[PDB]
Enzyme design. Structure first.
Site, PDB file in Angstrom:
ATOM      1  N   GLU A 180       0.847  -1.196   0.000  1.00 21.29           N
ATOM      2  CA  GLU A 180       0.000   0.000   0.000  1.00 21.29           C
ATOM      3  C   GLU A 180       0.885   1.250   0.000  1.00 21.29           C
ATOM      4  O   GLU A 180       1.860   1.293   0.738  1.00 21.29           O
ATOM      5  CB  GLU A 180      -0.951   0.036   1.206  1.00 21.29           C
ATOM      6  CG  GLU A 180      -2.090   1.051   0.976  1.00 21.29           C
ATOM      7  CD  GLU A 180      -3.071   1.117   2.112  1.00 21.29           C
ATOM      8  OE1 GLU A 180      -2.940   0.312   3.046  1.00 21.29           O
ATOM      9  OE2 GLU A 180      -3.980   1.975   2.077  1.00 21.29           O
ATOM     10  N   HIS A 185      -7.390  -2.517  14.724  1.00 23.61           N
ATOM     11  CA  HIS A 185      -7.502  -1.777  13.467  1.00 23.61           C
ATOM     12  C   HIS A 185      -7.272  -2.669  12.243  1.00 23.61           C
ATOM     13  O   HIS A 185      -8.102  -2.715  11.331  1.00 23.61           O
ATOM     14  CB  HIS A 185      -6.506  -0.618  13.483  1.00 23.61           C
ATOM     15  CG  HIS A 185      -6.577   0.267  12.283  1.00 23.61           C
ATOM     16  ND1 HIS A 185      -7.267   1.465  12.281  1.00 23.61           N
ATOM     17  CD2 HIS A 185      -6.015   0.153  11.054  1.00 23.61           C
ATOM     18  CE1 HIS A 185      -7.142   2.036  11.095  1.00 23.61           C
ATOM     19  NE2 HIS A 185      -6.386   1.258  10.335  1.00 23.61           N
ATOM     20  N   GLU A 186      -6.157  -3.393  12.223  1.00 21.31           N
ATOM     21  CA  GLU A 186      -5.873  -4.251  11.072  1.00 21.31           C
ATOM     22  C   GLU A 186      -6.903  -5.372  10.938  1.00 21.31           C
ATOM     23  O   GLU A 186      -7.282  -5.735   9.820  1.00 21.31           O
ATOM     24  CB  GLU A 186      -4.454  -4.836  11.163  1.00 21.31           C
ATOM     25  CG  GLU A 186      -3.355  -3.767  11.466  1.00 21.31           C
ATOM     26  CD  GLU A 186      -3.398  -2.544  10.548  1.00 21.31           C
ATOM     27  OE1 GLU A 186      -3.865  -2.624   9.377  1.00 21.31           O
ATOM     28  OE2 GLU A 186      -2.969  -1.466  11.006  1.00 21.31           O
ATOM     29  N   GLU A 229      -2.796  -4.078   6.766  1.00 20.25           N
ATOM     30  CA  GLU A 229      -3.839  -5.117   6.791  1.00 20.25           C
ATOM     31  C   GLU A 229      -3.805  -6.139   5.630  1.00 20.25           C
ATOM     32  O   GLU A 229      -4.855  -6.628   5.197  1.00 20.25           O
ATOM     33  CB  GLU A 229      -5.210  -4.426   6.822  1.00 20.25           C
ATOM     34  CG  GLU A 229      -5.638  -3.774   5.481  1.00 20.25           C
ATOM     35  CD  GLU A 229      -5.218  -2.316   5.310  1.00 20.25           C
ATOM     36  OE1 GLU A 229      -4.270  -1.849   5.991  1.00 20.25           O
ATOM     37  OE2 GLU A 229      -5.859  -1.647   4.478  1.00 20.25           O
ATOM     38  N   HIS A 243     -10.154  -4.117   9.311  1.00 20.37           N
ATOM     39  CA  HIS A 243      -9.968  -3.934   7.869  1.00 20.37           C
ATOM     40  C   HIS A 243     -10.420  -5.150   7.059  1.00 20.37           C
ATOM     41  O   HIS A 243     -10.691  -5.037   5.855  1.00 20.37           O
ATOM     42  CB  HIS A 243      -8.491  -3.658   7.534  1.00 20.37           C
ATOM     43  CG  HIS A 243      -8.129  -2.202   7.477  1.00 20.37           C
ATOM     44  ND1 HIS A 243      -8.891  -1.258   6.808  1.00 20.37           N
ATOM     45  CD2 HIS A 243      -7.077  -1.531   7.996  1.00 20.37           C
ATOM     46  CE1 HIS A 243      -8.320  -0.072   6.919  1.00 20.37           C
ATOM     47  NE2 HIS A 243      -7.209  -0.210   7.624  1.00 20.37           N
ATOM     48  N   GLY A 258       2.449   2.183  11.454  1.00 22.67           N
ATOM     49  CA  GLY A 258       2.110   1.250  12.533  1.00 22.67           C
ATOM     50  C   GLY A 258       1.933  -0.212  12.121  1.00 22.67           C
ATOM     51  O   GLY A 258       2.531  -1.118  12.722  1.00 22.67           O
ATOM     52  N   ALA A 259       1.093  -0.452  11.114  1.00 20.30           N
ATOM     53  CA  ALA A 259       0.838  -1.810  10.628  1.00 20.30           C
ATOM     54  C   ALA A 259       0.053  -1.773   9.324  1.00 20.30           C
ATOM     55  O   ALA A 259      -0.445  -0.718   8.895  1.00 20.30           O
ATOM     56  CB  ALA A 259       0.086  -2.639  11.664  1.00 20.30           C
TER      57      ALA A 259
HETATM   58  O1  LIG Z   1      -4.085   2.303   8.090  1.00 17.87           O
HETATM   59  C1  LIG Z   1      -3.099   1.601   8.303  1.00 17.87           C
HETATM   60  N1  LIG Z   1      -3.128   0.307   8.554  1.00 17.87           N
HETATM   61  O2  LIG Z   1      -4.302  -0.287   8.500  1.00 17.87           O
HETATM   62  C2  LIG Z   1      -1.703   2.176   8.416  1.00 17.87           C
HETATM   63  N2  LIG Z   1      -1.708   3.390   9.227  1.00 17.87           N
HETATM   64  C3  LIG Z   1      -1.033   3.502  10.362  1.00 17.87           C
HETATM   65  O3  LIG Z   1      -0.407   2.577  10.876  1.00 17.87           O
HETATM   66  C4  LIG Z   1      -1.160   4.939  10.962  1.00 17.87           C
HETATM   67  C5  LIG Z   1      -2.272   4.956  12.017  1.00 17.87           C
HETATM   68  C6  LIG Z   1      -1.784   4.135  13.229  1.00 17.87           C
HETATM   69  C7  LIG Z   1      -0.663   4.930  13.521  1.00 17.87           C
HETATM   70  C8  LIG Z   1      -0.845   6.120  14.288  1.00 17.87           C
HETATM   71  C9  LIG Z   1      -1.240   7.011  13.099  1.00 17.87           C
HETATM   72  C10 LIG Z   1      -0.092   7.004  12.050  1.00 17.87           C
HETATM   73  C11 LIG Z   1       0.172   5.519  11.582  1.00 17.87           C
HETATM   74  C12 LIG Z   1       0.565   4.706  12.807  1.00 17.87           C
HETATM   75  C13 LIG Z   1      -2.516   6.427  12.455  1.00 17.87           C
HETATM   76  C14 LIG Z   1      -0.985   2.464   7.214  1.00 17.87           C
HETATM   77  C15 LIG Z   1      -0.521   1.425   6.417  1.00 17.87           C
HETATM   78  C16 LIG Z   1       0.247   1.692   5.277  1.00 17.87           C
HETATM   79  C17 LIG Z   1       0.559   3.012   4.936  1.00 17.87           C
HETATM   80  C18 LIG Z   1       1.399   3.258   3.843  1.00 17.87           C
HETATM   81  C19 LIG Z   1       1.104   4.072   2.772  1.00 17.87           C
HETATM   82  C20 LIG Z   1       2.093   4.255   1.790  1.00 17.87           C
HETATM   83  F1  LIG Z   1       1.829   4.999   0.717  1.00 17.87           F
HETATM   84  C21 LIG Z   1       3.346   3.669   1.892  1.00 17.87           C
HETATM   85  F2  LIG Z   1       4.304   3.862   0.931  1.00 17.87           F
HETATM   86  C22 LIG Z   1       3.657   2.895   2.982  1.00 17.87           C
HETATM   87  F3  LIG Z   1       4.865   2.365   3.051  1.00 17.87           F
HETATM   88  C23 LIG Z   1       2.683   2.689   3.954  1.00 17.87           C
HETATM   89  C24 LIG Z   1       0.119   4.073   5.748  1.00 17.87           C
HETATM   90  C25 LIG Z   1      -0.656   3.786   6.878  1.00 17.87           C
HETATM   91 ZN   LIG Z   2      -5.880   1.246   8.319  1.00 21.58          ZN
END
Ligand SMILES: O=C(NO)[C@H](NC(=O)[C@H]1[C@H]2C[C@@H]3C[C@@H](C[C@H]1C3)C2)c1ccc(-c2cc(F)c(F)c(F)c2)cc1
Ligand SMILES: [Zn+2]
Ligand SMILES: [Mg+2]
Ligand SMILES: [Mg+2]
Ligand SMILES: [Mg+2]
Ligand SMILES: [Mg+2]
Length: 889
Positions: free
Chosen positions: A124, A301-302, A268, A305, A265-266
């Protein structure tokens, strides 16, 4: 810079039905062979066949097993592979390729890369194109048949999506595994992992179908003892989705894998969720309390998803908030139910109103569904996530739980197995709205403005009470400031959860009521109101807005003491603090400007201090809530209310207010710090990783908050308490003892002691770095230089870099040194990081987001550093794009 526009979405002229991969990991390179079974869609107009492919080394490419020749039949420019249309078949065809990639040197941590001794992917949003050629967009759904091979000694554990259907030996010490994943998925949910991984496992039996699900949680061998809480959290997540939403997992196995090097963070990935180690691993001896809530939230969260993002996916990246806002909302419901503490909701409000409000009043402001982007790696914002979550949560507030659940089921049942858009969700909610309102003329068309309109609404009130008529009115107005996105802002559908408190006895005067404000202004009238009430407004923080309650401090105190809603009590306290802060700030500013030899400051309201004492001394009151009321609002919350913010004046303001309150309450603080000890630091369950007590952790939060206040105040002999605290088994305590010792000559003694406790656990050492970085030290710059030379060095681990530098940027007095040296330091780190990880370099820009809100000298200093970064010849697309938007160029 290619700009992508939401309005330009059109389906592809091509279809990819099946992906068959062979990923052969070798010492110096990884060879990726891919066969794509393709077709021509009804939208095709004879265009060239163009694949995304970034940084791939082509060995060969073929169509229907006929080798294509470069120049004549295709061109590749390291970003796009173009096959000229005259060579593209007009019916079902096979495209094949073999490319070479190099995970070992992939320090940007996108695509396929190596983290310590683990090979791992992150696709992603558009990282799959860094692994092989593809039409890399989420509406290109396909089946995946994936084989991974590797050295068996180095990489005994091989994982991908789907069922493992074969395992086999290979000459020369190698082995392979084949995974088949028949359900259609977008390529950003593809994952592969290879490594010497150790695990814990369990079996979960679903609620209704009674399917057995195998649960595996993996890490490197050293940290396998830190996996237990994550497995418990996964079980809890599955149960919650079953219990609240009636949703069951339908795959045979779910794997969670921790890696040390991760941009966020992680992730899915279907059946193979991949985590930042700091969001999966914990033990009570080697983690701070915050890890336990973090792991619960990120595992949750994951998992959520799997329906909201995986089974129902995205048409295109502009719909991101449809999976992220909705999954954060699901995770918030989950964590509120699991923790049963009011601080869980309060902490999400606190995050929104400081960080997201700042974003929404910055040059970066955007709606939760933006109209354009250049970089997807910069698109994952607190606006999309946290304001998105609040917008998803408002549907529940508007509909109530029964009809929200009905609406959610409609969304899942209509869109399961498909791509979807924000309109699809609104449509489902609308069907429930019609049912709730019992008329099919009701609609949520206005609600869609929450997806398209940027900026934070301001909601303000006027009240009137007719004592003879026993009639009370609440007049409400909404206003969003114009910005770069909309010249004219439209009124939103704002749900206002309200109560009316009887000031004589503190009791509720009306039943649960949600005002539906749909116009620029409205007046809500209530009959049979026997006495003039104090209104309890936006209970639970019922809309993502600036609340202007127009209450007196006396009224706010009454709410703080006696209201039933935790948020309104917390907000009433916040509003009292803000009134004081703005008043004292202006008094200090004028003294500075006028170079006054003497001047007066308005004291903190004495009845307010009495109310804090009252709540603090109430044994039946909540410890986490108590920690919020003795803490001033976040600096990044405050800055939204002040023009040309002089950070020195604000620091002086905060110090005066804390000192005023401490001069009255310090003996109470100390008494509580001592009385809370037995329960807060109870070691009964210290060696049980299944046993997590969020009330107890909130009690430690309170003690550690009080200890900080007493240390800054130089409370008599508090250093004794500090030294004893440093001997606690809980890292939250002994790391606190380091940061509060900053005010004493024992700081470096505690620096060495806690370093020694931290240095042998990768994640604990990161927490120690954060603690040092955040230390209130006059010599913090010298200390930072020491961390650089002795601990950080040239680590490319994002957790290491972020730990050393980000907490320091919240040092109001030192990061904002008028020399500009803190700005210069972070800009050097950003430029250095941008060489190998543009995504994380842009995260390190976060301090600069408020640049145009500071005093003119600091504005100029910050702008100079940003222009300096922009002039770097080798600047990434990410960083350039971001800084150009941030500096309004
Ligand atoms: O939504 C997500 N997982 O379900 C995930 N988001 C997170 O882990 C966020 C969430 C949870 C955290 C606290 C805050 C910032 C971070 C860590 C909100 C996430 C996963 C992949 C990416 C992502 C996007 C890119 F374009 C990329 F190049 C990459 F390496 C990762 C960004 C956020
Ligand atoms: Zn997410
Ligand atoms: Mg390459
Ligand atoms: Mg159950
Ligand atoms: Mg390391
Ligand atoms: Mg602009």
């Amino acid at each position: 810079p290619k700009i992508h526009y939401r309005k330009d979405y059109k389906p592809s002229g091509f279809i990819i039905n099946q992906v068959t991969l062979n990923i052969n990991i070798h010492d110096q390179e990884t060879i990726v062979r891919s066969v794509l079974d393709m077709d021509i869609s009804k939208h095709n107009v004879g265009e060239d066949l163009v694949f995304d492919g970034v940084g791939l080394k082509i060995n060969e490419i073929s169509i229907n097993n006929k080798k294509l020749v470069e120049g004549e039949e295709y061109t590749y420019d390291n970003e796009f592979l173009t096959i000229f249309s005259k060579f593209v078949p007009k019916s079902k065809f096979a495209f094949s390729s073999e490319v070479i990639i190099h995970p070992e040197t992939n320090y940007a941590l996108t695509g396929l890369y190596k983290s310590k001794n683990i090979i791992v992917s992150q696709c992603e949003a558009t990282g799959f194109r860094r692994i092989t050629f593809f039409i890399d967009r989420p509406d290109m759904m396909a089946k995946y048949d994936v084989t991974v091979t590797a050295d068996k000694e180095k990489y005994p554990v091989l994982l991908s999506n789907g069922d493992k259907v074969n395992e086999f030996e290979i000459p020369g010490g190698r082995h392979g595994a084949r995974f088949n994943d028949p359900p259609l998925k977008p390529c950003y949910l593809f994952a592969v992992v290879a490594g010497d991984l150790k695990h814990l496992s369990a079996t979960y039996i679903t609620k209704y179908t009674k399917k057995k699900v195998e649960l595996y949680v993996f890490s490197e061998e050293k940290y396998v003892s830190k996996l237990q809480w994550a497995l418990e959290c996964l079980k809890k997540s599955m149960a919650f989705d079953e219990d609240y939403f009636g949703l069951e997992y339908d795959l045979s196995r779910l794997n969670l894998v921790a890696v040390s090097d991760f941009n966020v963070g992680a992730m899915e990935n279907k059946g193979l969720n991949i985590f930042n180690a700091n969001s999966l691993l914990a033990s009570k001896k080697n983690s701070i309390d915050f890890s336990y809530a973090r792991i619960l939230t990120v595992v949750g969260h994951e998992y959520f998803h799997q329906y909201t993002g995986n089974r129902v996916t995205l048409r295109d990246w502009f719909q991101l908030t449809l999976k992220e806002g909705l999954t954060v909302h699901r995770e918030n419901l989950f964590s509120e139910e699991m923790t049963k503490t009011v601080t869980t909701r309060l902490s999400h409000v606190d995050l929104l109103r400081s960080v997201q409000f700042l974003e929404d009043s910055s040059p970066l402001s955007h709606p939760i569904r933006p109209e354009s982007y250049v970089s997807m790696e910069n698109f994952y914002t607190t606006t999309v996530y946290d304001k998105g979550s609040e917008v998803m949560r408002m549907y529940l507030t508007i509909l109530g739980e029964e009809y929200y659940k009905k609406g959610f089921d409609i969304y899942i049942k209509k869109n399961d197995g498909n791509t979807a858009t924000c309109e699809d969700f609104n449509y489902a909610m609308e069907q429930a709205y019609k049912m709730k309102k019992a008329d099919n003329s009701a609609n949520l068309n206005q609600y869609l403005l929450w997806f398209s309109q940027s900026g934070t609404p301001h909601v303000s009130f006027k009240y009137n009470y007719d004592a003879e008529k026993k009639q009370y009115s609440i007049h409400v107005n909404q206003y969003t400031k114009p910005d770069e996105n909309q010249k004219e802002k439209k009124p939103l559908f704002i749900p206002i959860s309200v109560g009316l408190i009887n000031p004589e006895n503190g009791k509720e005067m009306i039943s649960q009521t949600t005002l539906e404000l749909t116009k620029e202004s409205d007046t809500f009238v209530f009959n049979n109101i026997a006495v003039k009430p104090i209104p309890s407004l936006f209970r639970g923080f019922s809309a993502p807005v600036y609340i202007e309650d127009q209450l007196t401090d006396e009224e706010r105190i009454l709410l703080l003491k006696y209201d039933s809603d935790a948020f309104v009590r917390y907000n009433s306290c916040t509003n009292i603090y803000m009134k004081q802060i703005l008043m004292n700030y202006n008094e200090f500013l004028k003294a500075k400007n006028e170079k006054l030899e003497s001047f007066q400051l308005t004291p903190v309201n004495a009845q307010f201090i009495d109310a804090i004492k009252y709540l603090l001394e109430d044994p039946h009151a909540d410890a986490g809530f108590k920690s919020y009321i003795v803490s001033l609002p976040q600096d990044r919350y405050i800055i939204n209310f002040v023009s040309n913010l002089d950070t020195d004046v604000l620091a002086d303001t905060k110090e005066y207010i804390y000192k005023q309150i401490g001069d009255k309450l310090n003996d109470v603080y100390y008494k509580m710090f001592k009385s809370l000890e037995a329960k807060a630091d109870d070691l009964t369950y210290f060696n049980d990783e299944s046993h997590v007590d969020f009330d107890q952790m909130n009690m430690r939060t309170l003690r550690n908050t009080l200890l900080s206040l007493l240390s800054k105040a130089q409370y008599p002999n508090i250093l004794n308490e500090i030294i004893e605290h440093s001997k606690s088994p809980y890292p939250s305590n002994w790391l606190t003892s380091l940061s509060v010792s900053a005010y004493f000559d024992k700081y470096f003694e505690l620096y060495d002691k806690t370093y020694k406790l931290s240095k042998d656990d990768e994640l604990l050492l990161q927490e120690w770095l954060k603690t040092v970085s955040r230390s209130d030290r006059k010599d913090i710059y010298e200390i930072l230089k020491k961390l650089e030379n002795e601990v950080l060095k040239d680590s490319k681990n994002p957790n290491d870099i972020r730990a050393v530098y980000l907490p320091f940027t919240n040092n109001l007095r030192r990061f904002h040194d008028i020399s500009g040296k803190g700005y210069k330091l972070i800009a050097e780190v950003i430029t250095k990081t941008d060489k190998f990880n543009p995504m994380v370099a842009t995260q390190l820009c976060e301090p600069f987001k408020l640049w145009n809100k500071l005093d003119t000298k600091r504005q100029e200093l910050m702008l100079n550093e940003m222009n300096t970064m922009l002039q770097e010849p080798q600047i990434s697309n990410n960083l350039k794009e971001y800084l150009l938007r941030l500096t309004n160029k």
